[PDB]
C-alpha cells in the first residue's frame, strides 16, 4: 500500500493487523525475509521495518490504468532532459 519513500512500518502498526503482540512479529518478519516475500532489514531499536522489495502479484484493469499515467509521467521527464542536452551540448559539440 505504501508506495514511496514512505516504506517503513512500525512494529505496533504490523501487530494490530497481524493479531499478535510485538514479540512474535520479529520472528514473523524473519520467515518472510527467509522465503523471499520480503527483502530488507529490521531496525529493531526504533521499531522500524525496511520494506525494500516485495514480490509481484496480479493486478486488475483498474490498477493498470494508474500505472499507465505513472509511467507516462516518467516519459516526459526523459523527453525534456534529452531536450535539455540537445540544446547547448548537441548544438556545438555535435
Amino acid at each position: 500500500t505504501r508506495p514511496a519513500n514512505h516504506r517503513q512500518l512500525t512494529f505496533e502498526e504490523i501487530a494490530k493487523s497481524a493479531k499478535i503482540t510485538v514479540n512474535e512479529v520479529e520472528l514473523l518478519v524473519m520467515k518472510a525475509l527467509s522465503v523471499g516475500l520480503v527483502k530488507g532489514s529490521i531496525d529493531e531499536v526504533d521499531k522500524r521495518v525496511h520494506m525494500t522489495w516485495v514480490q509481484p502479484r496480479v493486478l486488475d484493469l483498474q490498477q493498470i490504468k494508474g500505472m499507465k499515467d505513472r509511467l507516462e509521467f516518467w516519459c516526459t521527464d526523459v523527453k525534456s532532459m534529452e531536450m535539455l542536452v540537445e540544446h547547448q551540448a548537441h548544438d556545438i559539440l555535435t
Binding site: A4, N5, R7, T52, W53, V54, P56, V58, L59, L61, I64, K65, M67, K68, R70, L71, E72, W74, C75, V78, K79, M81, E82, V85, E86, A89, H90, L93, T94
Partner: protein, 292 residues
C-alpha cells in the same frame, strides 16, 4: 540459453550488406516479403560469430501461416559448396528480414535445426530507421509456466552487436569517407553517446506506454507476466534512500571538480608557456627580417 553456450551474437558487416543485397535480388514484385537465408559462421564460447550467408529460395502465404516453403535440398547442396571453399563454416543459424517476428518463424526454426542445434535467428532490417542496431538475435528455447499451460517453443532475446576484422574494418572505413565521423573528437563523441542514449530510453519506454495503454482500453487480453516485470521496474527506481544519497553524491562531485580544477590549470600554464615560445621566436625573427 540457460546454457552459457550462447550470448554475444556478433555479425560482421559483409553479412549485413549481404542480406540487404538479397532483399533486392528477390525484389521485383516479390518484395514486401520476408526473405530468409542461412547464417554460416564459427564460434567456441558465449559467441556466435556470423560471417557468411546466402539466400535460400523461400516462399510464404500472405494470409496463412502453415503454407511456407524452404528448399532445404538447396541448403544441403550449397552448404557443401561453401565448405569446399572454406573449412570451419558450419551453419550457426539463419536470418529473416524482419520487420519483426511472425508466428510462422518457430516452424522454420525446426527445419533449420535439422542441421545444427543452437540455431539462432538474426532479425536484420531492410529499412534504416531504428537508432539502435538493426540486428536482434533470438533463440528457440522452451519452458514451463506457473499458470500450468503446456510447454511451448517461445523465442528468447540475447544481446547483440556487430564486430569486425581487419578486412571488414578497412572496407567499411573506405565506404564512409563521404559521411565523415572522425572529425568529431573524444569528449564530444561521448557526450553524443549520452544524448543518443536518452534517444533510446525515450522510445523504449514509449513502446511500453503504448502497450499498457493497449490492454487497458481497446482491449487486448492481459498477459500477467509483462505486468509482473513492470512492477519490479517501479520498485527498482532510485528513490527511497533520498536524503543520504543526496549528501553523498554532492561529495563525490566535489572531488570531481577538485581534479578538473587541477587539470584545466596545468593546461593553462602549459599553453601560456607555448605563447612565451612564440613571442621569443618572433623577436629573433625580427632581427632576421632586418639585416640586408
Amino acid at each position: 540459453m540457460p546454457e552459457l553456450a550462447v550470448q554475444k551474437v556478433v555479425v560482421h558487416p559483409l553479412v549485413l550488406l549481404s542480406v540487404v543485397d538479397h532483399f533486392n535480388r528477390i525484389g521485383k514484385v516479390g518484395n514486401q516479403k520476408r526473405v530468409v537465408g542461412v547464417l554460416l559462421g564459427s564460434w567456441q564460447k558465449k559467441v556466435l560469430d556470423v560471417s557468411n550467408s546466402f539466400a535460400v529460395p523461400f516462399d510464404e502465404d500472405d494470409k496463412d501461416d502453415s503454407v511456407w516453403f524452404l528448399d532445404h535440398d538447396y541448403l544441403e547442396n550449397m552448404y557443401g559448396m561453401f565448405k569446399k571453399v572454406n573449412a570451419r563454416e558450419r551453419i550457426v543459424g539463419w536470418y529473416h528480414t524482419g520487420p519483426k517476428l511472425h508466428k510462422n518463424d518457430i516452424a522454420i526454426n525446426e527445419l533449420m535445426k535439422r542441421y545444427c542445434p543452437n540455431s539462432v535467428l538474426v532479425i536484420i532490417d531492410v529499412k534504416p530507421k531504428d537508432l539502435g542496431l538493426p540486428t536482434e538475435a533470438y533463440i528457440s528455447v522452451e519452458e514451463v509456466h506457473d499458470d500450468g499451460t503446456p510447454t511451448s517453443k517461445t523465442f528468447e532475446h540475447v544481446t547483440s552487436e556487430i564486430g569486425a576484422e581487419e578486412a571488414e574494418e578497412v572496407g567499411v572505413e573506405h565506404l564512409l569517407r563521404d559521411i565523415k565521423d572522425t572529425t568529431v573528437g573524444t569528449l564530444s563523441q561521448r557526450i553524443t553517446n549520452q544524448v543518443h542514449g536518452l534517444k533510446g530510453l525515450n522510445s523504449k519506454l514509449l513502446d511500453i506506454r503504448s502497450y499498457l495503454e493497449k490492454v487497458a482500453t481497446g482491449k487486448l487480453p492481459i498477459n500477467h507476466q509483462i505486468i509482473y516485470q513492470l512492477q519490479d521496474v517501479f520498485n527498482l527506481l532510485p528513490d527511497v534512500s533520498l536524503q543520504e544519497f543526496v549528501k553523498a553524491f554532492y561529495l563525490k562531485t566535489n572531488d570531481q571538480m577538485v581534479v578538473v580544477y587541477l587539470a584545466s590549470l596545468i593546461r593553462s600554464v602549459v599553453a601560456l608557456h607555448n605563447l612565451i615560445n612564440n613571442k621569443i621566436a618572433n623577436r629573433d625573427a625580427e632581427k632576421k627580417e632586418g639585416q640586408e
